[PDB]
Amino acid sequence: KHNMKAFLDELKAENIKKFLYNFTQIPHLAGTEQNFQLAKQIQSQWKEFGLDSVELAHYDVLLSYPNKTHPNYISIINEDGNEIFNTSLFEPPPPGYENVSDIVPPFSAFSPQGMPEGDLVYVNYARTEDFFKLERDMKINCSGKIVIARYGKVFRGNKVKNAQLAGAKGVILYSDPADYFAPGVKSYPDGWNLPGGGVQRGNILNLNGAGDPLTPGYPANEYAYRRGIAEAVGLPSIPVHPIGYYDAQKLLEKMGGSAPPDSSWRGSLKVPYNVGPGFTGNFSTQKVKMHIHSTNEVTRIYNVIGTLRGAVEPDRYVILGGHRDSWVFGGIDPQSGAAVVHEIVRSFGTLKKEGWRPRRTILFASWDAEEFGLLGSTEWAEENSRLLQERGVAYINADSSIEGNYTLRVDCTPLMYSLVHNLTKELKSPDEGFEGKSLYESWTKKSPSPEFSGMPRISKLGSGNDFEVFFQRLGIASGRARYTKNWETNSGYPLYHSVYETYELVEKFYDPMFKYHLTVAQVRGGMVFELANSIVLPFDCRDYAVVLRKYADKIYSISMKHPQEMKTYSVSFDSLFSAVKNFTEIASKFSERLQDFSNPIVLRMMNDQLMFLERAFIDPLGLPDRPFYRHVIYAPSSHNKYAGESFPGIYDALFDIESKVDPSKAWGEVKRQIYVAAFTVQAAAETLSEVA
Amino acid sequence: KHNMKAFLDELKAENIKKFLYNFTQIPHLAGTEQNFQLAKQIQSQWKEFGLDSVELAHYDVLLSYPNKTHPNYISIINEDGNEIFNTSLFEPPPPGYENVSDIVPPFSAFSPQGMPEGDLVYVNYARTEDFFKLERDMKINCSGKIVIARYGKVFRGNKVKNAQLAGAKGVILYSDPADYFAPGVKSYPDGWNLPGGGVQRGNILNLNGAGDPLTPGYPANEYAYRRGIAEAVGLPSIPVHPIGYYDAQKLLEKMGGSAPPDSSWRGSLKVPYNVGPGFTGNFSTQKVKMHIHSTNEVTRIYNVIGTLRGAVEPDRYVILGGHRDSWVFGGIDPQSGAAVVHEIVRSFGTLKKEGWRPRRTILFASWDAEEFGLLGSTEWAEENSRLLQERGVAYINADSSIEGNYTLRVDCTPLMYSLVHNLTKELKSPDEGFEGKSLYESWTKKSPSPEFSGMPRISKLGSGNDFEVFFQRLGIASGRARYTKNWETNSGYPLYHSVYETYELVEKFYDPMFKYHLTVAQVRGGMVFELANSIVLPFDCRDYAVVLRKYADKIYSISMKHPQEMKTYSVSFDSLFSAVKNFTEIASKFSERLQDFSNPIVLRMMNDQLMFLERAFIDPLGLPDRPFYRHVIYAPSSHNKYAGESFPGIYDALFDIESKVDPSKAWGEVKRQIYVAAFTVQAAAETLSEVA
Numbered sequence A, B: 001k002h003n004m005k006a007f008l009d010e011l012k013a014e015n016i017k018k019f020l021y022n023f024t025q026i027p028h029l030a031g032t033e034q035n036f037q038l039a040k041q042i043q044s045q046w047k048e049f050g051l052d053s054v055e056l057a058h059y060d061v062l063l064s065y066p067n068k069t070h071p072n073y074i075s076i077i078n079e080d081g082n083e084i085f086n087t088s089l090f091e092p093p094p095p096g097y098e099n100v101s102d103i104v105p106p107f108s109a110f111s112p113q114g115m116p117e118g119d120l121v122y123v124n125y126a127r128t129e130d131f132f133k134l135e136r137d138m139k140i141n142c143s144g145k146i147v148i149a150r151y152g153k154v155f156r157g158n159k160v161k162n163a164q165l166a167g168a169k170g171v172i173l174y175s176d177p178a179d180y181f182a183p184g185v186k187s188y189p190d191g192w193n194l195p196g197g198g199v200q201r202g203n204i205l206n207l208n209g210a211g212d213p214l215t216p217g218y219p220a221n222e223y224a225y226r227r228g229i230a231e232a233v234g235l236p237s238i239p240v241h242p243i244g245y246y247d248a249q250k251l252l253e254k255m256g257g258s259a260p261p262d263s264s265w266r267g268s269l270k271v272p273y274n275v276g277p278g279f280t281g282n283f284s285t286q287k288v289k290m291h292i293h294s295t296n297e298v299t300r301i302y303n304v305i306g307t308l309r310g311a312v313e314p315d316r317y318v319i320l321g322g323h324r325d326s327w328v329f330g331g332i333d334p335q336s337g338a339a340v341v342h343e344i345v346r347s348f349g350t351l352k353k354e355g356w357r358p359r360r361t362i363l364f365a366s367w368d369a370e371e372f373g374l375l376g377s378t379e380w381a382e383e384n385s386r387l388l389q390e391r392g393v394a395y396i397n398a399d400s401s402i403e404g405n406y407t408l409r410v411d412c413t414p415l416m417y418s419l420v421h422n423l424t425k426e427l428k429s430p431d432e433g434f435e436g437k438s439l440y441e442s443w444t445k446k447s448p449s450p451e452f453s454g455m456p457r458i459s460k461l462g463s464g465n466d467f468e469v470f471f472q473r474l475g476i477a478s479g480r481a482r483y484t485k486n487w488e489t490n491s492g493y494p495l496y497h498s499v500y501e502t503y504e505l506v507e508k509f510y511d512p513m514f515k516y517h518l519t520v521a522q523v524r525g526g527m528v529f530e531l532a533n534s535i536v537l538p539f540d541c542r543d544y545a546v547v548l549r550k551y552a553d554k555i556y557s558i559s560m561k562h563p564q565e566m567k568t569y570s571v572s573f574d575s576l577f578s579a580v581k582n583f584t585e586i587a588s589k590f591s592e593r594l595q596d597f598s599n600p601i602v603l604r605m606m607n608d609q610l611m612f613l614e615r616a617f618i619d620p621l622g623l624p625d626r627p628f629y630r631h632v633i634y635a636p637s638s639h640n641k642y643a644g645e646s647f648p649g650i651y652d653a654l655f656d657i658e659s660k661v662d663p664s665k666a667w668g669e670v671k672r673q674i675y676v677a678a679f680t681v682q683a684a685a686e687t688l689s690e691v692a
């Protein structure tokens, strides 16, 4: 029999291990020869595995690279202009890799060039509230200063945006042991901690879903008309560079000026964490100088797109996608994900060779240039947007399979909650002490839901990964799952985007038996299997009704911190609660009809109502000043691209509203966003009413 | 048997005559009690006729009305401030209507208030080229002048926009006998010509598809958040008023300054048609003064929405819609259309009572406030946009059934061309001398296609009617048909928007036997019947491929007027011609599959490909500065809302390009629009490829 159990049983830990090893022996940086060769290998193997077609889709997009003959570094410079301390030119390579070529040195992708010189200010995590504290409470002015910020808490592009708006002339990012060194664990190669010479690479764009900075709205194909650099989307205006904590200590140890305002500003180094500006007494004439010479370059990238044609509904697409490009070896990010995709394709192909086909078409994607701003997935979705919005059932992401070994993490649309619960009850837990128990049981025990007894936590989607275009731009139901750490006893994982993130890291310290990888392959592959084969799409609209109420209560509570203004400007949430009530009632009736109807037209009318329900939350006018974030219920937080925000239009209208100089205008915009949200909820509800 | 012939045979001229009489006895101005009562009558009768549901959909939108106790008028004023001549306060009412209440006096809807005083400049039709001629060739400056323009050639809102950009402080519109008095025909009530006291009402907005000026993007429902007036969409900034040619003659006869530049600037009055500014010698100290006191008022409007549920595909909608509100009696516009809709509903209902149902759902609409800017259709489409874009098969408009008695006029998407040809070959011609011949034969004979022997002329859709939101915003295949005049021996019809447009006008002078109305009911009702019942949707994608080539040749020829700039800036149309070639090849292959496949999934996949093909030409970012015109192949001309323009993004980028001060920037934008057009054509083509 060809059923889900047949698909799941064919998946093997040993295969995933073999593929991870195969994918992580050399760097696969976006736009390089090595990553094009890997794309060709994947393409050939997916054909071998049995897919109906496997093509490369290429685009020419803006990338960023250091200059090989003019290296980036930071100095402390004395009053004579002598550089008395320099940060490192590269991370010491790990054992046995000291002769590997083409390891990109640490840099911040898309930094402009410059050599700014000035006094340091320490800005903690460079979050919106950190800058509020500096400027409003401490009266410290960042204008014309170089800021030094620790990585963690929020997406690094938001840090740079915040520094730039505070008037900084450059940004130094560093990894503090407080955030990247777990107590009692050794650093790499003897443990999974970050060594003092380790450095986190990463892009610092603020694209807001645009894709390639030069071609917002349209694929970067052969005849594309490109914006000039000065009109490009999302580039930083000040130089930026990342360093490790050995180098950070040398920059922080001399800092003077004001003391940290409280303990939440202090990391784990043996330094005062003074905010500045500048150094203490004896060193007051010394300055910090950056030397950045990286160049932005339009470069070709390649996605691999594999098709497994559906037997009954070939014009309905379930997409499993994850990226292939890495900063260096990609031991976790992304190859732990890509190896899982590879084994899933292999398993689906095994069944296909025996004569089986899924009910709906499955598309498999190996995305390029994710690390430079989700570029490969976004350009391909721009090219194919008409097909995706009329045919896209669901998108399941497949980046890093593991960031810990403690329990499952799932972030997804409410439409998938019931699917995920049901699937995990049928899978075996890989956890020690839970042998013979379900993954649902171990997950629910280790990560309880904050609101419901006997249910596990499932989070809303944020961004910072390839599902962004499908979910927040196009309104296609999306999900993701991976193994994670215990958040209570622990900021991602310490070796993230460093040369030390290797095959050996995973095989020695994360998942020696590859059983967590296998469990994640079962979850991602099982979700895809059910989405692509279930007669009735496995979405429960009633789960959306429950969360919409929770989010409406949440936004109303935020507004209710300002009761006098709500009275003065007549700010009512009545329409939003009415829409949510109507959605609840209509969804309940639709569910009854869905349970109560071989008449393939009613079924398909009803599958179309299920498929277009996520689509109904899209506003074609987009959110204010963010035209590619169109989903009215969810958008990436304007303060942290990684976090999702609910009712983002109202949330941003209320944020820091007490500091707006024209309260009538500000509260008018709150009321406008309430209207847009109530209207969109009611409109989505009405897509589930009887059609005529 | 219940087939198309049964539907068509049930339609009766005598019924249409009865309904027109019934609809035209009192004024039905949008927002008035009388028009709400008519909505309730229509609703009750459509239920009686047998529709499954018939509801009113109401909205609160910005309307405009004169002040009943402070009338609008224009004066000539002498140097002492004495008003020595005043324009009329109302049109002399027609025989037997001299005691009818609530006839709105002539006014321009949405004019601001004011009493500007100044020297006249005559600007011909106030077209873009008329202003070019004044400013560039004649060196005449309109700044601070009152302009007088004749109606005709272009939409009156474009005239006002053009006057406003030339710096005018007010606009007087008038009907010249050259454009509204056919030689050898008597004026009303003795013929169908415009009398000297007759005046054309009409709105002067520039909405660019926005709908209600206060709520662009969202329905004007009970909780809507409204823009303030100063931020409203499309309102004119200078006062505007319309007059008849008896009054115009008194204003023009004294004009001095420069002579008309040529004969194309001269109408038919016994005046010099001097351009001005100002009056000749003896009258040089006299001025013109406007007195406008109309008020914009948020007012409730009501659409009637009737549903005839489909038997097999109830989630696919074919819409027949036309407006019900009129300036006065609406003898032609719109009641000649609404009476035809009414008889069509009656006929469909007769078949339904005998047990028949169409394959797909048919929606019937009586729109309100069309005359004030397509407000009723646009608000309802904003409310229902998610349902319409995923379920909308086609929209057939149904305004004025007759504007002449010579031959058929059809404007529609290329997807309907074959449907229209085939249907008209099965209908009888109503024309004298063609008895026993088909409508196709009489139409083709009287209105030959400019490019193909033995085919009739079918025009592209412009705007200025209720199909605009469905076609140019939402990308739903749209069409319209009516009887028209001989354009060779004749500017609409003379009595348009005047008190004289009555039942008697139609019954005495246009269509005494109601046979032209009946033929138009057959065409509109037959199109709806085929769209709603044909197993395979009656769209031929190959007809789109043929026109796309014609439009690409046309736009390339415009650009080729500037060969040096094309060389300098490397402006190539190669990508657009490549996309059109690919569309042609793919459409041809799709047509073969469509001919070559009871497997209801392949059929529906293929009906969905047909339905979403018009949809594929929508760009969600819209055209430059016109976000509600999203169709990349067609938009209303930026110089004349009534006319359609093909490849409007490229057309507007090339328009008057030799007068742009930064040619590099201007030609860059031409190249951007070529890229957007080539990409959209290729993307639409690819929706017709095999789906997997």
Ligand SMILES: *[C@@H]1O[C@H](CO)[C@@H](O[C@@H]2O[C@H](CO)[C@@H](O[C@@H]3O[C@H](CO)[C@@H](O)[C@H](O[C@H]4O[C@H](CO)[C@@H](O)[C@H](O)[C@@H]4O)[C@@H]3O)[C@H](O)[C@H]2NC(C)=O)[C@H](O)[C@H]1NC(C)=O
Residues within 6 Å of the ligand: A575, A576, A578, A579, A582, A678, A679, A682, B222
């Ligand atoms: C949730 O679903 C419910 C339907 O179950 C839906 O209820 C609708 O609410 C609207 C807006 O409140 C009602 O609108 C009214 O309609 C009547 C005619 O049917 C009008 O006469 C009313 O207007 C008068 O009263 C107003 C309010 O005081 C005045 O402002 C106005 O000037 C008029 O005097 C009013 O427009 C509508 O009838 C119901 N529909 C029903 C019950 O079927 C509700 O809107 C949905 N929620 C959302 C957010 O969409």
Ligand SMILES: *[C@@H]1O[C@H](CO)[C@@H](O[C@@H]2O[C@H](CO)[C@@H](O[C@@H]3O[C@H](CO)[C@@H](O)[C@H](O[C@H]4O[C@H](CO)[C@@H](O)[C@H](O)[C@@H]4O)[C@@H]3O)[C@H](O)[C@H]2NC(C)=O)[C@H](O)[C@H]1NC(C)=O
Residues within 6 Å of the ligand: A222, B575, B576, B578, B579, B582, B678, B679, B682
């Ligand atoms: C109409 O349909 C046809 C398909 O029948 C489609 O043809 C495609 O054209 C593109 C763009 O011209 C071709 O792109 C090439 O692809 C190869 C790899 O397959 C690349 O190596 C090429 O790049 C090299 O050469 C370029 C041109 O000189 C250089 O600029 C570049 O730097 C590289 O050296 C190039 O990208 C594509 O292969 C075909 N696809 C086919 C034939 O299947 C055409 O694009 C469609 N028209 C439109 C408007 O979409």
Ligand SMILES: *[C@@H]1O[C@H](CO)[C@@H](O[C@@H]2O[C@H](CO)[C@@H](O)[C@H](O)[C@H]2NC(C)=O)[C@H](O)[C@H]1NC(C)=O
Residues within 6 Å of the ligand: A021, A022, A023, A025, A040, A041, A044, A045
């Ligand atoms: C990763 O695995 C692939 C697939 O087995 C290897 O590529 C093959 O290499 C052999 C021996 O060189 C060739 O004969 C095949 O043509 C290759 N197959 C392909 C590309 O599909 C590759 O060597 C492995 N890489 C590493 C680093 O171990």
Ligand SMILES: *[C@@H]1O[C@H](CO)[C@@H](O[C@@H]2O[C@H](CO)[C@@H](O)[C@H](O)[C@H]2NC(C)=O)[C@H](O)[C@H]1NC(C)=O
Residues within 6 Å of the ligand: A081, A082, A083, A084, A085, A086
């Ligand atoms: C840090 O790096 C700089 C750049 O290489 C060093 O300064 C240079 O030293 C060379 C050789 O002594 C001089 O000829 C260059 O003119 C210097 N360049 C600049 C920009 O100053 C510097 O010595 C290094 N500092 C330390 C402490 O190692």
Ligand SMILES: *[C@@H]1O[C@H](CO)[C@@H](O[C@@H]2O[C@H](CO)[C@@H](O)[C@H](O)[C@H]2NC(C)=O)[C@H](O)[C@H]1NC(C)=O
Residues within 6 Å of the ligand: A418, A419, A422, A538, A539, A540, A595
């Ligand atoms: C998850 O599993 C539950 C329990 O089996 C499913 O709910 C049942 O679905 C069937 C089929 O419609 C109903 O007859 C039962 O009444 C349901 N039981 C309940 C609600 O307790 C549920 O549909 C599954 N969710 C999916 C497949 O998305």
Ligand SMILES: *[C@@H]1O[C@H](CO)[C@@H](O[C@@H]2O[C@H](CO)[C@@H](O)[C@H](O)[C@H]2NC(C)=O)[C@H](O)[C@H]1NC(C)=O
Residues within 6 Å of the ligand: B021, B022, B023, B025, B040, B041, B044, B045
């Ligand atoms: C237009 O026709 C309608 C429908 O026949 C007329 O309205 C009816 O009037 C009669 C007599 O007053 C009433 O008993 C009915 O209740 C009405 N039916 C409706 C509203 O559906 C109306 O009188 C006609 N109007 C004119 C001007 O002739």
Ligand SMILES: *[C@@H]1O[C@H](CO)[C@@H](O[C@@H]2O[C@H](CO)[C@@H](O)[C@H](O)[C@H]2NC(C)=O)[C@H](O)[C@H]1NC(C)=O
Residues within 6 Å of the ligand: B081, B082, B083, B084, B085, B086
């Ligand atoms: C045109 O209309 C105006 C406005 O009614 C007339 O001027 C008014 O005449 C009355 C009575 O003679 C005066 O008391 C008002 O003060 C006048 N108003 C203004 C604004 O001038 C005017 O006489 C009419 N002109 C003609 C030729 O009929």
Ligand SMILES: *[C@@H]1O[C@H](CO)[C@@H](O[C@@H]2O[C@H](CO)[C@@H](O)[C@H](O)[C@H]2NC(C)=O)[C@H](O)[C@H]1NC(C)=O
Residues within 6 Å of the ligand: B418, B419, B422, B538, B539, B540, B595
């Ligand atoms: C208009 O009528 C023509 C002529 O009947 C239709 O074209 C025929 O369609 C049938 C059915 O697929 C084919 O077998 C014939 O070969 C076609 N004849 C031709 C092209 O000359 C055409 O489909 C009709 N158009 C519609 C219904 O939109």
Ligand SMILES: O=C(O)CC[C@H](NP(=O)(O)OC[C@H](NC(=O)c1ccccc1)C(=O)O)C(=O)O
Residues within 6 Å of the ligand: A202, A203, A333, A370, A371, A372, A373, A374, A399, A400, A462, A463, A464, A465, A491, A492, A641, A642, A643
């Ligand atoms: O440019 C973008 O939007 C993201 C590019 C790139 N994404 P990637 O490193 O592959 O994945 C980061 C992403 N991070 C998170 O989901 C996350 C979520 C919560 C807190 C902190 C991080 C992930 O682990 O999936 C990055 O974050 O630098």
Ligand SMILES: O=C(O)CC[C@H](NP(=O)(O)OC[C@H](NC(=O)c1ccccc1)C(=O)O)C(=O)O
Residues within 6 Å of the ligand: B202, B203, B333, B370, B371, B372, B373, B374, B399, B400, B462, B463, B464, B465, B491, B492, B641, B642, B643
């Ligand atoms: O506001 C709008 O966009 C249009 C409102 C209103 N439409 P309406 O008068 O009902 O119809 C005008 C419309 N005019 C044309 O189609 C037309 C087409 C070509 C040349 C001149 C006129 C029609 O006859 O359908 C008007 O034109 O004043």
Ligand SMILES: *[C@@H]1O[C@H](CO)[C@@H](O)[C@H](O)[C@H]1NC(C)=O
Residues within 6 Å of the ligand: A067, A068, A069, A070, A295
């Ligand atoms: C990189 O630096 C070298 C050496 O100083 C320089 O000559 C070259 O122009 C640079 N490459 C760039 C800017 O792409």
Ligand SMILES: *[C@@H]1O[C@H](CO)[C@@H](O)[C@H](O)[C@H]1NC(C)=O
Residues within 6 Å of the ligand: A141, A142, A143, A144
């Ligand atoms: C910060 O410093 C600069 C002076 O160099 C000044 O222009 C800017 O206005 C200052 N901002 C504040 C808030 O004091």
Ligand SMILES: *[C@@H]1O[C@H](CO)[C@@H](O)[C@H](O)[C@H]1NC(C)=O
Residues within 6 Å of the ligand: A192, A404, A405, A485, A509, A510
């Ligand atoms: C794997 O799990 C064990 C047992 O809890 C733990 O001690 C170890 O730190 C984990 N490894 C990682 C990389 O989290």
Ligand SMILES: *[C@@H]1O[C@H](CO)[C@@H](O)[C@H](O)[C@H]1NC(C)=O
Residues within 6 Å of the ligand: B067, B068, B069, B070, B295
């Ligand atoms: C209409 O004009 C009258 C009479 O002069 C005035 O009192 C009233 O305010 C006006 N109505 C308006 C502006 O709506």
Ligand SMILES: *[C@@H]1O[C@H](CO)[C@@H](O)[C@H](O)[C@H]1NC(C)=O
Residues within 6 Å of the ligand: B141, B142, B143, B144
């Ligand atoms: C037209 O007239 C006014 C003078 O009142 C002037 O401000 C404006 O610049 C003039 N325009 C041209 C083109 O001469």
Ligand SMILES: *[C@@H]1O[C@H](CO)[C@@H](O)[C@H](O)[C@H]1NC(C)=O
Residues within 6 Å of the ligand: B192, B404, B405, B485, B509, B510
């Ligand atoms: C109706 O047709 C006749 C015959 O051609 C013509 O003389 C008359 O002018 C037409 N009426 C109208 C209103 O066009």
